[PDB]
Amino acid sequence: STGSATTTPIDSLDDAYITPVQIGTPAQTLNLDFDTGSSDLWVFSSETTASEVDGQTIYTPSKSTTAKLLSGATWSISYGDGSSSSGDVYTDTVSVGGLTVTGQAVESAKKVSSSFTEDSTIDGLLGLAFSTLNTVSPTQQKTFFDNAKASLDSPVFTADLGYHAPGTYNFGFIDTTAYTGSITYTAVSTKQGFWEWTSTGYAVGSGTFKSTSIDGIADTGTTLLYLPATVVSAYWAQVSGAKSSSSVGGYVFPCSATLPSFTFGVGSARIVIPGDYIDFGPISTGSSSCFGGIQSSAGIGINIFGDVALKAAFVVFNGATTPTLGFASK
Numbered sequence: 001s002t003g004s005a006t007t008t009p010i011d012s013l014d015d016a017y018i019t020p021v022q023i024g025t026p027a028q029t030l031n032l033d034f035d036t037g038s039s040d041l042w043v044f045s046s047e048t049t050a051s052e053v054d055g056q057t058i059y060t061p062s063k064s065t066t067a068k069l070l071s072g073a074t075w076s077i078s079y080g081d082g083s084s085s086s087g088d089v090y091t092d093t094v095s096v097g098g099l100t101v102t103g104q105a106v107e108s109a110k111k112v113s114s115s116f117t118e119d120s121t122i123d124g125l126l127g128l129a130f131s132t133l134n135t136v137s138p139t140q141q142k143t144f145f146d147n148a149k150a151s152l153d154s155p156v157f158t159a160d161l162g163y164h165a166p167g168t169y170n171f172g173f174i175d176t177t178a179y180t181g182s183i184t185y186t187a188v189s190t191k192q193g194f195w196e197w198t199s200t201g202y203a204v205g206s207g208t209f210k211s212t213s214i215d216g217i218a219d220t221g222t223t224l225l226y227l228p229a230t231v232v233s234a235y236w237a238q239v240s241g242a243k244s245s246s247s248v249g250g251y252v253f254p255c256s257a258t259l260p261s262f263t264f265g266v267g268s269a270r271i272v273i274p275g276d277y278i279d280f281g282p283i284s285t286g287s288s289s290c291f292g293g294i295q296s297s298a299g300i301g302i303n304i305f306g307d308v309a310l311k312a313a314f315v316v317f318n319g320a321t322t323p324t325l326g327f328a329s330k
């Protein structure tokens with residue numbers, strides 16, 4: 001089997017991407033944030049505290065003839081950005097782009113933190129990291145991809161995120177018309193439950209490539225590119241007037257600037273992030289100070305190849321017995 005679904009930016013800055021997902025019988029379609037950095041499929045629901053729902057579409061398990069309460073199961077997750085959610089668990093039929101899993105754990109939120117409430121466009125998350133990170137207790141549950149894998153034509157999914165435009169998540173096949181050149185594959189460590197890999201270096205604009213190992217995670221659920229402070233300083237030093245602002249929370253730059261590109265290595269291959277992808281717009285409405293798309297990972301504990309990096313590539317998440325990642329230009 002295969003599936004194919006369009007993923008759409010939630011706003012004009014590409015702050016996140018939503019993909020429609022069918023849950024239950026008859027189908028209830030929710031727009032979920034596919035997150036290769038976590039492993040829970042959780043949704044706003046009829047059980048979510050009412051004051052914490054503000055415009056999201058909810059899953060109502062009592063209206064699904066295939067929903068079954070997973071007796072005794074609870075979940076609670078805290079994300080690296082400080083947001084969180086928790087609740088109870090159903091199993092139900094879940095379909096993405098024509099690919100169907102029966103018996104998928106659907107984690108129904110009783111509580112969500114304020115950042116989720118305040119984002120009316122995200123109805124929940126669909127985790128695509130390794131199932132070892134799933135938070136359901138006392139019986140850990142499998143991700144949608146893990147449940148589908150054995151049925152897929154090939155045990156893979158691909159992320160093709162657009163810049164200020166829709167893109168595609170495919171399951172079970174590699175669309176050879178979606179990228180240019182060849183796909184370069186690179187090794188993955190699953191030891192921390194992430195799609196963790198080692199980039200071979202970077203360049204800033206037309207500068208010379210610096211060969212250096214950068215261990216990080218391919219994370220579709222993180223907006224920006226988080227890299228070591230040395231690399232990030234070298235980038236922003238090429239932008240007149242850019243500076244790290246402790247009060248704003250990262251590097252800011254004059255909105256009048258033309259940003260240089262940023263290149264990252266995948267083996268001997270090179271992915272080029274155009275400068276425009278690194279502009280996240282005014283820090284507050286009407287300001288002439290703009291927020292940078294490349295930020296330091298120093299306070300995080302891991303480097304993160306988030307959407308800013310991944311949208312510049314066609315990315316293969318290869319879930320074969322030994323997982324790997326593939327990157328192609330597009």
Ligand SMILES: CCNCCOc1ccc(Cl)c(C)c1
Nearest residue numbers: 079080081083115119221222
């Ligand atoms: C920490 C990086 N990714 C995991 C959390 O992802 C999101 C996505 C959407 C929203 Cl609204 C929030 C608050 C978090």
